[PDB]
Structure 1
Amino acid sequence: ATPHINAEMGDFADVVLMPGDPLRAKYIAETFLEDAREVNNVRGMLGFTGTYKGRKISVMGHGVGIPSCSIYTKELITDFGVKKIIRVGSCGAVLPHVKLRDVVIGMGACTDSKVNRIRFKDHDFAAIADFDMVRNAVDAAKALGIDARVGNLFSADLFYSPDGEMFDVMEKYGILGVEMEAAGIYGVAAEFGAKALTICTVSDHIRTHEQTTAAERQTTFNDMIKIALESVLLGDK
């Protein structure tokens, strides 16, 4: 039992899927996992552990922003023996060729947060995902006939940034998606010796927003979820 997770060692699987702000952990568990049991309820942050094709897997949200996900990912790693963390959420795009509903894999994550500088003696720590997890996600996506773009994400501290010019800079440097967690999670993974990966589905254009109906949402979200789950089975092979 930790300060924010009311569970015990063994309650969570070695692999944890963490739903972004959209997806719900309860939805993932009852739709993709079999024999799911509830392992956490603190702050309504429902956690679940079940199996996917015989493989043990847990699911639990990470909350909005670096400070929030940093809490949970740290405790899962040091107190519940979790080895892999896969975040599945949404992101905004700044690149014209990146479209609404595209799946983006964050091999790296830029940020305007100060958490990584505090850890790295104020130098540049390249917040990156585990390579194998990236390749598993990409391969699982190809197997499902889904084209997944791999590159940098940008984890912002302020959803409502005062500096609108930064989005242009992001576009110039190839950032595929803007979210608020990746860099924080990768920082924790490196700090405590674990592996992590962030997968996002473009929910909107920070430029010229398109128009995909609610029917064209849960269908793409299920895709990202399958990618995540299937990528885990590939990693075991």
Structure 2
Amino acid sequence: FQSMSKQPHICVDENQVSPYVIVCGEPDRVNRIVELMDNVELLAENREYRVFNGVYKGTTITICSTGIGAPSMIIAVEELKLCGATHVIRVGSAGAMQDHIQLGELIVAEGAVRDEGGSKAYISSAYPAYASFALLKEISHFLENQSVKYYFGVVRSHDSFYTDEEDQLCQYWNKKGILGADMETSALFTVGRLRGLQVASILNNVVLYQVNQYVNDNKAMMNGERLAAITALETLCKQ
């Protein structure tokens, strides 16, 4: 029946999707982010794509999981774009590339090394993956007001942390001053920008670079997730 008008992966349309969007890897994180919003509604659920609308401080925002990886991210960006998204903020996870960065502290990517094939499918790797400065301004301002430590800088996005060369990759990138590594940021920044989106990425640190420990760690991380979501929500509701 109504299977003609919907985007084939995110399963939503023009009218459903807000111009303002948050994406994350984990479908179950979508339910956690909507907890913070009013007037929540499930829009679609398909494969790794879980899509909700919610209202935060008066502004209607769409929350969308995209699974792990640049290809699954790019699929959601293209289809969100077609539904009228203009501002998209990644809220995600990272492994630290500097030893001073603790669990549940935030990395805000100003730029990203394009070490994933996803963005390369579109354009020469020479094209920059960077965050919209208007969004960065707002993110910086929200994060200043609170106590959890956060770092602005370059992250690396890649397609595997499981090569035998992971150690050396880490060390090389540590010396270049990269803050953290994910799989999705540079693809958002590249494809998003090429489709005229304003984009940004707020990453929760979940691996150190280096029983009761476990519980505090998990709490720290869960606190970082919440902060990252709130920061993204605070930023989008100003536009």
Q: TM-score, normalised by structure 2?
A: 0.89
1:18 pairs with one of 4, 19, 23 = 23
Deviates more, 1:154-163 or 1:37-46: 37-46
1:47 pairs with one of 18, 33, 51 = 51
Distance in 1 (CA, whole Å) between partners of 2:140 and 2:223 is 19
Gaps of 5+ in 1: none
Which amino acid in structure 2 is aligned with residue 158 of structure 1? S
Partner of 2:135: 133
> Aligned pair 1:32/2:31, yes or no?
no
**Equivalent residue of 1:119, what SS?**
coil
Q: Note the C-alpha offset of 1:63.
A: 1.1
- Percent identity for Structure 1 against Structure 2: 24
2:195 pairs with one of 192, 196, 204 = 192
> Structure 1 stretches (4+) deviating beyond 4 angstroms?
none
Partner of 1:206: 209
> Aligned pair 1:8/2:44, yes or no?
no
Partner of 2:3: none
Gaps of 5+ in 2: 1-5
> Aligned pair 1:101/2:100, yes or no?
no
Partner of 2:179: 176
Give deviations 1:135-180, integer Å, cap 9, x for gaps. 1111111123444211011111012123231111110111111110
Q: Note the C-alpha offset of 1:105.
A: 0.3
1:229 pairs with one of 210, 229, 233 = 233
Distance in 2 (CA, whole Å) between partners of 1:47 and 1:123 is 31
Is 1:117–1:125's contact at 8 Å kept on the other side of the alignment?
A: no
Which amino acid in structure 1 is aligned with residue 43 of structure 2? V
Is 1:151–1:175's contact at 8 Å kept on the other side of the alignment?
A: yes
Which amino acid in structure 2 is aligned with residue 46 of structure 1? R
Give deviations 1:61-91, integer Å, cap 9, x for gaps. 11101011000011101x2100111111111
Is 2:103–2:207's contact at 8 Å kept on the other side of the alignment?
A: yes
Q: Note the C-alpha offset of 1:206.
A: 3.3
Distance in 1 (CA, whole Å) between partners of 2:104 and 2:221 is 8
Distance in 1 (CA, whole Å) between partners of 2:13 and 2:121 is 30
2:71 pairs with one of 67, 70, 94 = 67
Q: TM-score, normalised by structure 1?
A: 0.90
